[PDB]
Paper text:
CTX-M-15 (cefotaximase-Munich-15) is a class A extended-spectrum β-lactamase (ESBL) capable of hydrolyzing penicillins and cephalosporins, including third- and fourth-generation cephalosporins such as ceftazidime and cefepime, respectively. It is predominantly plasmid mediated, disseminated worldwide, and encountered in diverse Gram-negative pathogens, mostly Enterobacterales, but occasionally also in nonfermenters. CTX-M-15, like other class A SBLs, employs an acylation-deacylation mechanism to hydrolyze β-lactam antibiotics, utilizing four invariant residues: Ser70, Lys73, Ser130, and Glu166. In this study, ultrahigh-resolution X-ray crystal structures and mass spectrometry revealed the mechanism of PAS inhibition of CTX-M-15, an extended-spectrum β-lactamase (ESBL) globally disseminated among Enterobacterales.
To investigate the process of cross-link formation, we obtained structures from cocrystals of enmetazobactam and tazobactam with CTX-M-15E166Q, a conservative mutant in which Glu166 is replaced by an isosteric Gln, such that deacylation of the acylenzyme formed during β-lactam hydrolysis is impaired. Additional diffraction data collected for uncomplexed CTX-M-15E166Q indicate that Asn170 adopts two conformations in the E166Q-substituted active site, with the conformation observed in the native enzyme being the minor conformer (occupancy, 0.28). Gln166 in apo-CTX-M-15E166Q adopts the same orientation as Glu166, with other active-site residues also in equivalent positions. Mutation of Glu166 to Gln does not affect backbone or side chain geometry. The catalytic water (Wat; green or blue sphere) moves 0.8 Å due to the movement of Asn170.
Residue numbers in the entry: 29 to 287
């Protein structure tokens, strides 16, 4: 029945929907197009921040390292970085800005620090994620052209990797806690997965959006008095200038968590 409901939602939406839910209560999954590729857009900021956190495990004062912000760093969406032009921000501050405001300059500084998109991808491989690929920097990584494998992953792979990062042992205890704290403080996700869950549930999530009306969210969820869940909801549309559809992600979240 969950499968029929997701198929009906996809049909009504007019687009292509990818869902992966991991329920850690019983080690089960709910999957819909979960092995297809989707453009990650800003959901890839989780992997970039995690790569910096991993690097910090052998470089204690890494997160305090200062990074210059210049006019030449500005890209298309810079809500935090635009306030710090001609000063510096720490790597911790850049991580928080990327994860909690979806700041694209912040993402680019995390990418650059670790060596570029191929280094973020190599980190994913080291974790056992052989699907994720980060090809480009901001702002071009969210073009989300149908058929283009650049800057894509699958729902299954991203759910499994997010579980490892937030609930598993990819990161040391301090670094895992820091990632979870950052994601729980996200400001951009209230209309996405969160909108399909009861108000009492606790969520750490990262949204993304891009061309072709691409609208994404990945989340770790602590339901009231239950074992945690991991949920990836990816969505993309046929028209280049399609509008956002955060409501589709909320609907998918409601379908897969009902009962």
């Amino acid at each position: 029945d969950v499968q029929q409901k997701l198929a009906e939602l996809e049909r009504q939406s007019g687009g292509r929907l990818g869902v992966a839910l991991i329920n850690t209560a019983d080690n089960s999954q709910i999957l819909y197009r979960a092995d297809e590729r989707f453009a990650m857009c800003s959901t890839s900021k989780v992997m970039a921040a995690a790569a910096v956190l991993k690097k910090s495990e052998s470089e204690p004062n890494l997160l305090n390292q200062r990074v210059e912000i210049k006019k030449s760093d500005l890209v298309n969406y810079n809500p935090i970085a635009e306030k710090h032009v001609n000063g510096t921000m720490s790597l911790a501050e850049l991580s928080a800005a990327a994860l909690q405001y979806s700041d694209n300059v912040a993402m680019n500084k995390l990418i650059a620090h670790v060596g570029g998109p191929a280094s973020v991808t190599a980190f994913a491989r080291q974790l056992g994620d052989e699907t994720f690929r980060l090809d480009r920097t901001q702002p071009t990584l969210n073009t989300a052209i149908p058929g283009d494998p650049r800057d894509t992953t699958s729902p299954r792979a991203m759910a499994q990797t997010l579980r490892n990062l937030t609930l598993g042992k990819a990161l040391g205890d301090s670094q895992r806690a820091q990632l979870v704290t950052w994601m729980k403080g996200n400001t951009t996700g209230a209309a996405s997965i969160q909108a399909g869950l009861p108000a009492s549930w606790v969520v750490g999530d990262k949204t993304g959006s891009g061309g072709y009306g691409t609208t994404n969210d990945i989340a770790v969820i602590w339901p009231k008095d239950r074992a945690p869940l991991i949920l990836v909801t990816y969505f993309t549309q046929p028209q280049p200038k399609a509008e956002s559809r955060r409501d589709v992600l909320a609907s998918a979240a409601k379908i897969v968590t009902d009962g």
